[PDB]
Design an enzyme around this catalytic site. Structure first.
Site, PDB file in Angstrom:
ATOM      1  N   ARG A 219     -48.408  -1.306 -41.124  1.00 50.21           N
ATOM      2  CA  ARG A 219     -48.529  -2.104 -42.880  1.00 50.21           C
ATOM      3  C   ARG A 219     -48.147  -3.285 -42.668  1.00 50.21           C
ATOM      4  O   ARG A 219     -47.099  -3.975 -42.644  1.00 50.21           O
ATOM      5  CB  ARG A 219     -47.407  -1.148 -43.482  1.00 50.21           C
ATOM      6  CG  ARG A 219     -47.213  -1.390 -45.030  1.00 50.21           C
ATOM      7  CD  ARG A 219     -46.299  -0.666 -46.023  1.00 50.21           C
ATOM      8  NE  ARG A 219     -46.277  -0.697 -47.206  1.00 50.21           N
ATOM      9  CZ  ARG A 219     -45.285  -1.212 -47.948  1.00 50.21           C
ATOM     10  NH1 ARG A 219     -44.042  -1.601 -47.310  1.00 50.21           N
ATOM     11  NH2 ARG A 219     -45.263  -1.436 -49.235  1.00 50.21           N
TER      12      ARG A 219
ATOM     13  N   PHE B  34     -46.725 -11.424 -48.015  1.00 45.05           N
ATOM     14  CA  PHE B  34     -45.624 -10.691 -48.197  1.00 45.05           C
ATOM     15  C   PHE B  34     -44.704 -10.288 -46.969  1.00 45.05           C
ATOM     16  O   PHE B  34     -43.672 -10.813 -46.436  1.00 45.05           O
ATOM     17  CB  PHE B  34     -45.889  -9.395 -48.851  1.00 45.05           C
ATOM     18  CG  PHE B  34     -44.671  -8.433 -49.220  1.00 45.05           C
ATOM     19  CD1 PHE B  34     -43.380  -8.959 -49.554  1.00 45.05           C
ATOM     20  CD2 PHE B  34     -44.749  -6.939 -49.194  1.00 45.05           C
ATOM     21  CE1 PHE B  34     -42.319  -8.032 -49.884  1.00 45.05           C
ATOM     22  CE2 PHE B  34     -43.757  -6.386 -49.398  1.00 45.05           C
ATOM     23  CZ  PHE B  34     -42.416  -6.633 -49.576  1.00 45.05           C
TER      24      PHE B  34
ATOM     25  N   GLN C  69     -45.106  -4.869 -41.117  1.00 41.35           N
ATOM     26  CA  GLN C  69     -44.054  -3.917 -41.113  1.00 41.35           C
ATOM     27  C   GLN C  69     -44.583  -2.962 -39.666  1.00 41.35           C
ATOM     28  O   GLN C  69     -45.801  -2.593 -39.489  1.00 41.35           O
ATOM     29  CB  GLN C  69     -43.962  -2.885 -42.258  1.00 41.35           C
ATOM     30  CG  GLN C  69     -43.179  -1.798 -42.165  1.00 41.35           C
ATOM     31  CD  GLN C  69     -42.936  -1.135 -43.470  1.00 41.35           C
ATOM     32  OE1 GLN C  69     -43.354  -1.664 -44.718  1.00 41.35           O
ATOM     33  NE2 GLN C  69     -42.288   0.088 -43.663  1.00 41.35           N
TER      34      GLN C  69
ATOM     35  N   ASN D 139     -36.849   0.813 -45.402  1.00 39.62           N
ATOM     36  CA  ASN D 139     -36.124   1.894 -45.875  1.00 39.62           C
ATOM     37  C   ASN D 139     -36.674   2.879 -47.024  1.00 39.62           C
ATOM     38  O   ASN D 139     -37.738   2.188 -47.531  1.00 39.62           O
ATOM     39  CB  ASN D 139     -34.564   1.753 -46.149  1.00 39.62           C
ATOM     40  CG  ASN D 139     -34.620   0.953 -47.461  1.00 39.62           C
ATOM     41  OD1 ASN D 139     -34.900   1.201 -48.511  1.00 39.62           O
ATOM     42  ND2 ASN D 139     -33.770  -0.467 -47.175  1.00 39.62           N
TER      43      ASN D 139
ATOM     44  N   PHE E 132     -39.342  -4.845 -41.010  1.00 39.94           N
ATOM     45  CA  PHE E 132     -40.336  -5.765 -41.320  1.00 39.94           C
ATOM     46  C   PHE E 132     -39.956  -7.268 -41.082  1.00 39.94           C
ATOM     47  O   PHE E 132     -38.903  -7.648 -40.975  1.00 39.94           O
ATOM     48  CB  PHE E 132     -40.789  -5.552 -42.753  1.00 39.94           C
ATOM     49  CG  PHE E 132     -39.590  -5.817 -43.882  1.00 39.94           C
ATOM     50  CD1 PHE E 132     -38.719  -4.692 -44.047  1.00 39.94           C
ATOM     51  CD2 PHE E 132     -39.802  -6.910 -44.518  1.00 39.94           C
ATOM     52  CE1 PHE E 132     -37.809  -5.038 -44.961  1.00 39.94           C
ATOM     53  CE2 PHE E 132     -38.916  -7.397 -45.616  1.00 39.94           C
ATOM     54  CZ  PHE E 132     -37.826  -6.298 -45.926  1.00 39.94           C
TER      55      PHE E 132
ATOM     56  N   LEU F  81     -35.937  -8.210 -52.664  1.00 35.63           N
ATOM     57  CA  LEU F  81     -35.410  -7.483 -51.639  1.00 35.63           C
ATOM     58  C   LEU F  81     -33.994  -7.594 -51.333  1.00 35.63           C
ATOM     59  O   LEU F  81     -33.447  -6.734 -50.506  1.00 35.63           O
ATOM     60  CB  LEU F  81     -36.371  -7.372 -50.313  1.00 35.63           C
ATOM     61  CG  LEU F  81     -37.865  -7.213 -50.566  1.00 35.63           C
ATOM     62  CD1 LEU F  81     -38.408  -7.376 -49.077  1.00 35.63           C
ATOM     63  CD2 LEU F  81     -38.292  -5.963 -51.297  1.00 35.63           C
TER      64      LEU F  81
ATOM     65  N   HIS G  53     -32.444  -4.189 -48.868  1.00 37.45           N
ATOM     66  CA  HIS G  53     -32.916  -4.081 -47.362  1.00 37.45           C
ATOM     67  C   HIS G  53     -31.984  -5.026 -46.622  1.00 37.45           C
ATOM     68  O   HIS G  53     -31.698  -6.090 -46.876  1.00 37.45           O
ATOM     69  CB  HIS G  53     -34.439  -4.543 -47.277  1.00 37.45           C
ATOM     70  CG  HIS G  53     -35.470  -3.514 -47.988  1.00 37.45           C
ATOM     71  ND1 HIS G  53     -35.905  -2.462 -47.334  1.00 37.45           N
ATOM     72  CD2 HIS G  53     -36.137  -3.886 -49.122  1.00 37.45           C
ATOM     73  CE1 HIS G  53     -36.705  -1.938 -48.186  1.00 37.45           C
ATOM     74  NE2 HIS G  53     -36.577  -2.453 -49.158  1.00 37.45           N
TER      75      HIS G  53
END
Lengths: 161, 138
Positions: A54, A59, A62, A99, A110, A119, A123
């Site tokens: 991903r 951004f 991941q 998560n 990531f 975030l 995270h």
């Protein structure tokens, strides 16, 4: 105190470059240790040969689902608690746990390619890119707004430096 | 209702309260509920249900059905791995669909998403299943 680990990244089996990470054992020892041991393969499973499944340009990138979509496992069982949220997502290079909600850390992680403040507190940040940020930047171009990658981006090798 | 959010009409609530209180309308309770909740958000649905005075046992029984359906939703819809992209909110949990843990604005976001995540219609289905039990019993 703080270990350093490396990934050698490949694009469709062709070597792309090395990315190294400082892991913040001093502040999040349990989270650092999970990622460190998964990088060396010393438990007999880990990141080697897994993919960045991903990637969202602008951004993050991941990966760490080495079991296959929510997959992967930590060195402590399938999931572990959010250790703390002392450290923040301050910019590109930040290494943080993926998560599926509070206290659901496994193996997925990531790398930020931008400042991602929303975030913070959701995270667990546990490291940062040391060398090879330009490789992470190159990896971004294989992503989509969807997260779907246009090529197989893999961790051809990894270990502790 | 989404039309922009618009408050549920005063006499939609009227229709409803007066359809719950009168036994002669018992068979039309469910159809009436469906007709009176067109385009309803979960918040609208909770406002409508909770406007009814004097049926506390029935309403507690409905809530149990709702809570069961919310947990069943969660069982079959595990949350997606984050992190969430910028501008994106979570897929709704069962309690989000029921309006307990979601805000009106999140509900509107889901219902007007492209493609829609129809949290009003889903919740309406759960309520209707609960209303079946209470039409049967109370």
């Amino acid at each position: 105190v703080n270990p350093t680990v490396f990934f050698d990244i490949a694009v469709d089996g062709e070597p792309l470059g090395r990315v190294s990470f400082e892991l913040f054992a001093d502040k999040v020892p349990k989270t650092a240790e999970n990622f460190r041991a998964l990088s060396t393969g010393e438990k007999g499973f880990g990141y080697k040969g897994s993919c960045f499944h991903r990637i969202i340009p602008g951004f993050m990138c991941q990966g760490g689902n080495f079991t296959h979509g929510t997959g992967g496992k930590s060195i402590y069982g399938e999931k572990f608690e959010d250790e703390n949220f002392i450290l923040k997502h301050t910019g590109p290079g930040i290494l943080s746990m993926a998560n599926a909600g509070p206290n659901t850390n496994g193996s997925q992680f990531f790398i930020c390619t931008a400042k991602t403040e929303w975030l913070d507190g959701k995270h667990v940040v546990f490291g940062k890119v040391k060398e090879g940020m330009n490789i992470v930047e190159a990896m971004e171009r294989f992503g989509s707004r969807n997260g779907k990658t246009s090529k197989k981006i893999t961790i051809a090798d990894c270990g502790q430096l | 209702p989404i039309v922009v959010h618009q408050a549920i009409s005063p006499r939609t609530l009227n229709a409803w309260v007066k359809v719950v209180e009168e036994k002669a309308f018992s068979p039309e309770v469910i159809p009436m509920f469906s007709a009176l909740s067109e385009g309803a958000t979960p918040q609208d649905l909770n406002t409508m249900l909770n406007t009814v005075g004097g049926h506390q046992a029935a309403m507690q029984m409905l809530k149990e059905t709702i809570n069961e359906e919310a947990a069943e939703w969660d069982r079959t819809h595990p949350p997606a791995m984050g992190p969430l992209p910028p501008g994106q909110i979570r897929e709704p949990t069962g309690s989000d669909i029921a309006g307990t843990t979601s805000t009106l604005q999140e509900q509107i976001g889901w219902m007007t998403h492209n493609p829609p995540i129809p949290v009003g219609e889903i919740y309406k289905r759960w309520i209707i299943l609960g209303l079946n039990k209470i039409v049967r019993m109370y």
